[PDB]
């Protein structure tokens, strides 16, 4: 059908890729494959190498330094293409077979193998002031010709191509997310229950989140407001565990409940990026060069493996809060509140 080409400024080597994106399931990730066609007249001794780098930009879009370069690599895999690695056999797929059948015998293939527990391609929001490369983990495939592995990769005689790895939501939804906590004050031992539940476990990008809530205000107190917020917890794990708590969407419910009363109605939420542009630190799922994309789809993780070896993990948990008042003999409108969380998964379908 159609295969992508980058056609390096040297005009000699061109990288051919099957799919720009790459689906990564719960356990197995679709391998990448392609070929490169380089004019063999020039390549007398110089060897052509291709590579894939899982970059990690964190130092904004500031100017480059003498040796800082404000970058970090998570996984880098290089292979030799000219010659086509006679030492290691290449199990070329049908796409590779058709692709070098279309081209000549001088075209050379390449292949990598993504390991499972890696972050999906998510780029942090650059914001207004930043001008240049965006933050966040990013996949890049570049092809250059160099007889030495440590030799300089001259951009005038090299090429690069951008890859994103994406996850697709499971066909079978998980259990219904329900969580009801309770707590009382020192005035009396009559705690109140916050029955909070959702509709499903997997939601689609733009699908209306429908939070089901039910209050039981047995305590002799009032509820001024109910804080409903769907937040995005981005566990940025590179040298630390700086879990962010940016609220993607939130709403306020002014449904006061009398003491010794119960009340319940379903609220609707929709996470979207139209009004959250200016909020820096938001996680955006994938960027090719600068094209707009959605919020970060929640990353699927498999239990039993280490969760502390991953670059950026985005997980969504809608948080329900209710705020009360401590008025009485000695008190004012200011008081405390109790929070119970509700995890949910927000990702794309699997077409």
């Amino acid at each position, epitope marked *: *059908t*159609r295969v992508f080409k980058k056609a390096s400024p040297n005009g000699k080597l061109t990288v051919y890729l099957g799919k720009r994106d790459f689906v990564d399931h719960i356990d197995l990730v679709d391998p990448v494959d392609g070929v490169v066609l380089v004019d063999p007249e020039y390549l007398k001794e110089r060897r052509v190498y291709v590579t894939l780098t899982v970059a990690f930009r964190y130092g904004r879009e500031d100017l480059d330094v003498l040796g800082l370069t404000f970058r970090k690599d998570l996984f880098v895999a290089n292979v030799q293409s000219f010659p086509p690695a006679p030492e290691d056999k290449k199990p070329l797929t049908r796409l590779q077979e058709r692709l070098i059948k279309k081209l000549g015998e001088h075209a050379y293939p390449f292949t990598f193998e993504i390991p499972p527990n890696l972050p999906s391609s998510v780029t942090l929001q650059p914001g207004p002031e930043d001008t240049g490369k965006a933050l966040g983990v990013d996949y890049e495939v570049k092809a250059f010709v160099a007889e030495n592995l440590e030799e300089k990769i001259h951009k005038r005689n090299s090429v690069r191509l951008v890859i994103r790895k994406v996850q697709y939501a499971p066909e079978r939804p998980g259990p219904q997310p329900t969580a009801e906590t309770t707590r009382q004050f020192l005035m009396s031992d009559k705690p109140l229950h916050l029955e909070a539940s959702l509709d499903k476990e997997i939601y*689609y*990008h*733009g*699908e*209306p989140i429908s939070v089901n809530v039910h209050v039981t205000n047995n305590t002799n107190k009032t509820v001024k407001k109910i804080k409903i917020s769907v937040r995005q917890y981005a566990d940025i794990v590179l040298f630390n565990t700086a879990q962010y708590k940016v609220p993607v969407a939130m709403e306020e419910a002014d449904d006061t409940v009398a003491p010794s009363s119960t009340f319940s109605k379903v609220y609707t939420l*929709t*996470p*979207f*990026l*139209a*009004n959250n*542009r200016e909020k820096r630190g938001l996680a955006l799922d994938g960027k090719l060069k600068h094209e*707009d994309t*959605n919020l970060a789809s929640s990353t699927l993780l498999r239990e039993g493996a280490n969760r502390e070896i991953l670059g950026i993990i985005v997980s969504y948990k809608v948080k329900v809060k209710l705020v009360v008042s401590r008025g009485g003999l000695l008190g004012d409108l200011a008081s405390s509140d109790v929070a119970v969380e509700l995890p949910f998964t927000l990702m*794309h379908p699997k*077409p």
Partner: single-chain antibody
Amino acid sequence: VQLVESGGGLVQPGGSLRLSCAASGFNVYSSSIHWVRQAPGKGLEWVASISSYYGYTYYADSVKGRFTISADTSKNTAYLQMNSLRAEDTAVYYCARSRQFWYSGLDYWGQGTLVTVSSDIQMTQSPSSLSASVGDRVTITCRASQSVSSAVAWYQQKPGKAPKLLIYSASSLYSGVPSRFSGSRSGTDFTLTISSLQPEDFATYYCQQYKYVPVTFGQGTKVEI
């Protein structure tokens, strides 16, 4: 699962018109709303489109900034407010829906509001007309001035009814359409084939590109007997 479209009618030259278009059962933050014009016995013409997810407002070259917009997501309604209609505005306007994520052609179309008043990629279609009986092999080719990445969906419009797509991205046919329909990609020239010309299949076909904003329809090919 359908969409409604209203607000059109007779409007004097230089007037205004707030065309209302609403979708039932569609989240606005997962479906974009698009508007395509159509003159009397001519080709389609895209005028504007709005995607609520990014808050972006794309305009056509002819009515760039001269056509007001107003939409809300609580009522799942997008209103088309007109301003200073010219002589070229005497055209029936069709509100349409395409998947706001991973665009795959304007899938669900409205009934079309008929009003009357009193570089740019230019894809070309060939043949401009055809006449065939049942079972005759018919191939219709659309040629694009600048090459695209197979980002073309093919549509079947009968006389009067709302045009509907059959195959998106020129490769994959939509559900609900018989398998006898297909398409092909050949460089910058785009063709689709039909095996048997059934009485329902005897309808005008339209091609359009959506790789580069603004989108632009073909020339319009009429199928006769």
